[PDB]
Chain length 243, copies 4
Amino acid sequence: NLPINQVGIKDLRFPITLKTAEGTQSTVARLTMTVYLPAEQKGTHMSRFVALMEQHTEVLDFAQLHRLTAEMVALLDSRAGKISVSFPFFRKKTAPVSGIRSLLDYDVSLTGEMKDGAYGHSMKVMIPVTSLCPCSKEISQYGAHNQRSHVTVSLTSDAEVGIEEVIDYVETQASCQLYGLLKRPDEKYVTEKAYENPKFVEDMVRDVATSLIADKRIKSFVVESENFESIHNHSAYAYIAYP
Amino acid sequence: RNLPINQVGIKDLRFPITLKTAEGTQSTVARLTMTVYLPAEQKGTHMSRFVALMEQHTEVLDFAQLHRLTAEMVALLDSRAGKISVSFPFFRKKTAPVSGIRSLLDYDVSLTGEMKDGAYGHSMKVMIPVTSLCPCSKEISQYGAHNQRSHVTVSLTSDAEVGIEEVIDYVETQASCQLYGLLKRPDEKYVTEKAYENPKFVEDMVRDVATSLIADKRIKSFVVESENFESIHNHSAYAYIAYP
Amino acid sequence: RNLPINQVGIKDLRFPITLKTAEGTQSTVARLTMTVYLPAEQKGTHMSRFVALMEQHTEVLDFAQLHRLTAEMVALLDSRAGKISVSFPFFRKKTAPVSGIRSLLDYDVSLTGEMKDGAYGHSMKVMIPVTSLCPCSKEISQYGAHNQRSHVTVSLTSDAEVGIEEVIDYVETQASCQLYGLLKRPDEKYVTEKAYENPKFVEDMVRDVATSLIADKRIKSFVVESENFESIHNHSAYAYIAYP
Amino acid sequence: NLPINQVGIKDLRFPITLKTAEGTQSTVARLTMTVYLPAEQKGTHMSRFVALMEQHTEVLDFAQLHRLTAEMVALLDSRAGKISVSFPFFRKKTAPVSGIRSLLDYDVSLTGEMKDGAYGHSMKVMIPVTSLCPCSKEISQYGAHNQRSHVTVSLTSDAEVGIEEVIDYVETQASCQLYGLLKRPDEKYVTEKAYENPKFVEDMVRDVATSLIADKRIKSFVVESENFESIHNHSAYAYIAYP
Ligand SMILES: [Cl-]
Ligand SMILES: [Cl-]
Ligand SMILES: [Li+]
Ligand SMILES: [Li+]
Ligand SMILES: [Mn+2]
Ligand SMILES: [Mn+2]
Ligand SMILES: [Mn+2]
Ligand SMILES: [Mn+2]
């Protein structure tokens, strides 16, 4: 026969309202929603996944994802299941000299999982930052190549770790973080800061991983960084998984 | 305290390759991710050496050469461990079921080689586009049945070589019906009917493929996914089996 | 000699928006490309001012506000001409044909406003996913007919406002059958049969939609494309009509 | 009734062998192949497009595309049609100090078009380069932000313009061009060169457009540049169309 680990729907696009520590915002999600299927059961009930999403008007947060995942495995009459919800996430930032405010966008995934009435949750957040090359600075009489970099942090904890917490962990460690709106003094600040704080992809993943190890709510994690090397047409890349 | 890095190197280097499999040799274009382990005490790896390796090597890619490449990499980069993953479109000559007219079909393949302390392991992933036809549709309708393209993706790790086409055949054997670039009128008639007579849920498809893979004694672990681009909704029906 | 630049500014700024149309207000996420004309004698534009504009403006997007935005942009950037293009998913509440159970469907929309010397013009593009069912398949087969999802994309420019949902209705009216997120057993029966009874080639679909658009006196030009993700091949059947 | 401008197949993936001035190479293409459909004709003949590609074993070049497009409109019995073929294109480069050789990849589209026995052709080439900001350099006491940039050149001519010619036009104008393989002295050269040759996106499109205007084989063109600004999470962008 063969049991199926997960069966359900993938990439249902759906508007959501999201509440986190700093505020509530409206965004647009892709959802994948699946349940365990026992060896002798032929199929699951595909329409119920969509039925569940249409019924809940509730704002999404850590508590609401748990409640959705519970109601899902109940509704589909299964022992286990997963909801993963992916979305762009906005945060208001303050330029470092002018203090002019502007949004930046991050890509987030939240997963909730039931196994035999036990719940687990995990999250993934992609944070774009500036990386600048220490080797380039050191060998060159002037200048240093630099590029946008995508730092992706996956983690699982028991206590809630906020999206913005993960963002701050990474942005703190970057050669320089990004802003949508920069005035001339802000551009000057950012250029010089990056140049004063060059980091290899190695340095970045180690620097971030140390911060996460220190956060005792975190049970496991992966930190990746991809740097879109401005002098090549391919990327430098690294990752650390823990434990 | 310093922290070893699981994998560091280059990602998404695009590179032309010639590939040799059981059915012949072909020229394709790959994307490569090439990384080694970095111990705590070492500040960085040697990034240009990954590209040097590809530029230097001229030989046709196959299971043996991927092994040699991965071993040569860890040595060149002065490391104890590493991975090469190579992703590319893969073509195979197909024949129409009625006419016998031939055309190519394209598949997406990734091959990974991995070294750990001198121990080599290898895995592979293949996405096979098939036709899926819904049994519930046919069953409840006085005529017709909704169908759609579906992507079946098989990831496996093995102790001995498993050929790309063997993975393709394990899947295509099980499809409601397989795809062809070029179909004449009678072929299209055959393909329409086959699919109608052989409706399979995503659940049925992942199960039929997993059975074949559990039975192959070379396969130490696998995942079979199938995604059905339901022709009646704007989302997919999805399932997967991981084994063991 | 210096060269004027047709359009210069920012591209793919991602930004949350609230959109007001005839059927109600909704919150979505857009990508913006915002550019102005640069005359020969000017070295560069003022890049931060494009983002300043978006941050400053708080009002709901609609046909009028897009006009105001584009005019405010060219003034802020001290230029004679420019474009704002805003791309986003767009949702609409649908109802199942038998049960009457409601669910959303998602559409991809771009709206463009353009200023030239104080003259405003606007265009729009909408991708509508539909079901397509092949007439040749049905016709030659003793049972069944291959079908698949297909993307119908309508680009138009108009002198007066044409609503997003109006474009959606011009297409969906013509489909072999339209899509629904949530379908019960009887709905699925209805949708299977409708599609079977109403087979249409990509050629038929582009033609039926173009007829509606030629007839609308607001539409000064258009393109209708349809792509059918043929469930029997691994490539698409494609057509388009440009008018006039 | 209504005539259809173009009807046929889209994104057929297909291996091709390509001959250009510097050599022959094997790559993988996407093809879109369409014909005009008269007002009272119901449908075209979809299988013949694929039949045509399978029959021709010939290496692709400017002459062969013309011949394919001719044979297509003949075979489908139509007055007009288009073949567009898209593919990654490799070129061998020489590092600027060490002279170590390595490939770089470019994205190319070639289009051939028949209208009532008259042929036309056009091409599109995306060239990735390094861009470095003159404003950043000028205001900062040290450093200058820089990023990978995608310069896309579309042109139509009567006489053949080679892919490599379009690449050279662009690479010559970039703050610095890209290489896959760079040794430490090469990295030093590239860092300093870019920094000595900062250009705005405005400067880049004007500099390239001037080069193309000077090429009298070229009838019309578009030059775009998108710079993946290393300090923002969005791109600077410009284009010039001519005439
Ligand atoms: Cl993510
Ligand atoms: Cl291109
Ligand atoms: Li921990
Ligand atoms: Li000219
Ligand atoms: Mn470097
Ligand atoms: Mn069904
Ligand atoms: Mn057909
Ligand atoms: Mn700048």
